[PDB]
Design a protein around this nucleic acid. Sequence first.
RNA 1: CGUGGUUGACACGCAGACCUCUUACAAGAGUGUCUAGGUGCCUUUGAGAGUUACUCUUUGCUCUCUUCGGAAGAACCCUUAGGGGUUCGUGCAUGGGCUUGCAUAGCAAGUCUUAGAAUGCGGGUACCGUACAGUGUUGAAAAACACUGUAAAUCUCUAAAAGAGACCA
Lengths: 349, 349
Amino acid sequence: PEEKFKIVRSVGEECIQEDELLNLLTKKPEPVCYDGFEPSGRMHIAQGVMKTISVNKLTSAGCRVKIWIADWFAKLNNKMGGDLKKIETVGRYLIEIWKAVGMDVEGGKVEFLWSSKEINARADEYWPLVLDIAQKNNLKRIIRCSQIMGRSEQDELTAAQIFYPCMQCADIFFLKADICQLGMDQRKVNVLAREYCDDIKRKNKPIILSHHMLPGLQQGQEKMSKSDPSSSVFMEDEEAEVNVKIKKAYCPPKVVEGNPCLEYIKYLILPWFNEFTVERSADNGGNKTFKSYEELIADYESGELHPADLKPALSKSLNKILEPVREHFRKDSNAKELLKRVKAYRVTK
Amino acid sequence: PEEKFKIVRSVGEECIQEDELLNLLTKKPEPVCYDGFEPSGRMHIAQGVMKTISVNKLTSAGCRVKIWIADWFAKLNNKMGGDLKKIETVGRYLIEIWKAVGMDVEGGKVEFLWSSKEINARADEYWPLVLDIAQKNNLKRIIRCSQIMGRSEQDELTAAQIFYPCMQCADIFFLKADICQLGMDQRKVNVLAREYCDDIKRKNKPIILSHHMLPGLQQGQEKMSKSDPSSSVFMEDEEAEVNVKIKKAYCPPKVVEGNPCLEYIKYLILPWFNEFTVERSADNGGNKTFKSYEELIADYESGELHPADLKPALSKSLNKILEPVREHFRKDSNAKELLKRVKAYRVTK
RNA sequence: CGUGGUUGACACGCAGACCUCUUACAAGAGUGUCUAGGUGCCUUUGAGAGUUACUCUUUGCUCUCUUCGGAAGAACCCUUAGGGGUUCGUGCAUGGGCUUGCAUAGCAAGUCUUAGAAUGCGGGUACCGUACAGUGUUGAAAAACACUGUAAAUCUCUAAAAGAGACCA
């Protein structure tokens, strides 16, 4: 159990009630983890590789993982202008992406569940939960959750966006989930679920495992934005595109704070390869291999590792990571058509 | 058409866009009318007999009438504490009451539709309408509709009670409704549906027919309350209960304004029996039979008709109206059991 | 846009733009790459009929002499040399004066400037120079010329279409 605990706890940066997590792992052989994904356009790296890492860690720990393809949820936040057909193509594209990048789907522990299909099949189960969750929460509490949409409390919220936290909270119980492994931006809704548990006096509250939000490639971008293709590495970005984006990426020398390249290495490269190799000429200290983030940050702060050397190794590593996805979308005709259609779609806020 | 227009218009006190109503009657042979009824406990007189009068008027005018048994709508407002089983029992009790009092169900123009069964059967049609209606409407607008629940905008509104106006507005289109024949307290949500039509650019807006709210038997009670059994005549109230309630009813002499008994005569006795007879001794001017409300108010204000005579004749007329319901619930075992169970239930606000 | 090479090849000066790199931009660099269009000509053209949702408005596309009497220019038929014959190229908007009420102007309305070509845009034209692929040809290269097609790749790619009201909800 302690090994399982360490593995899962490594997935998220924040864990609410770690003791409950440990008890769950000891007592339940196959805990249920989920994450919810709006098919909101081209997938950037945090959705593909970081989520693959988290999910594979969870499955290796013995957990079952439900990937929630949030198609009506995409509509409610007006993605692709609310066209369910374009949403469905986007979701199929996303599923193909996770398959190609190395999601352990074949292990039989990962299930892709579509929100519309599942809720339609069992609406009698679902909507009562939505309605009650609303009933036990006052309005301001729901508005506070709007960040799950990438929207602020000051935004003119369409009342469908007041819906949105309600069904997302309901999903936790409809899916019978034990671990809420989601981004920090989902935290407010996840907490809501525990609050609801108090109102209904349900002892077994869901765990919250909040993941780090990978910053955007430009300065001061706490999170990647699909609206700026230049700040974000997309799963199907060509090697030249990746190289250019990384080259332009913010990376002041000897400054670790807010250096998005370093977080890319920390959260993407090291968790994937377990090591990071910087290839340099003999005059430049030669090749150096880093097995921990601490070594990288130490040499970077000292100035032994200069951004000019850091970024090329970085780009090479991401290109290696992304090559299987490019190959899949090049070889598989259905994935190729899905990607063509997705790239043809205008991204809506 | 003009005869049909007069008949229908006589049903509601307010009619929005009367001209649209006239065109509707001229163009569509069978206009579809609805009203929604929360199975919220014992049926007080205005829910049974006045609605029978209105519905029979509409059907006599050739309209189709859908009686909406709003059981999820009942749950959302915590009626009977939100238990669908007591809600269903109450709804069956209401249907039995409407059958017994003389609802023209045999005519084939009145359809009792359950919110649960209908919405569950066609959720794909229903819930998108709810979601879009919410999407177009800002939150303050939804809260303003809370009166449809018997709740104020200052009440701690459960977010289910923000659901409630949206679901009710959606009902209008889900039922494909042409005439919203409902109480004045529904007006705000009814108007919402017309506003929605502008937003979706739907030319054919639903006609809005708002009924008078029958006052409670006590002074200053603009509407009957199920929380005060003494102020409300229940359809199954025994003759003695009716007599006592009418005796205690507010009825100052020569004062017409705010006099409930006169309102019952105007809205229940005349529309039912087309006349009302006050039986008096020869020394008290003998029996007098009134064919119109103007005669009633004139003689009452003059003081020729004293409350001591008005109340007995009034109670006699209500007892005559209610006797079929008492007989039904006495003879039919299923109705008898339903009434027993309903009377056993605590009314929740 | 200038300097020299009289001339041209060919060099210097000016400016910009594209491509890579020194990164985080900024900043900087690099001949790494790109930078002549004009000329003159025609062009307000009546009215009707046919051309899809049903009808109406606005068009677009087709059939008759086809506003100043539009085949402008092109090309083909012949033709003594002046010509004719044949096919095609056949667009949109405003004015200001006078005149009816408005202190005057807008605002509501009538003829006139075939259209004040008067003012604009658009398009079709033949010549020049651009490059390119072909062809001949002078040239060891560079450089030079006759012709061929273009310079906006290209086509309502309409399945006529935009609105209003009907079938009627």
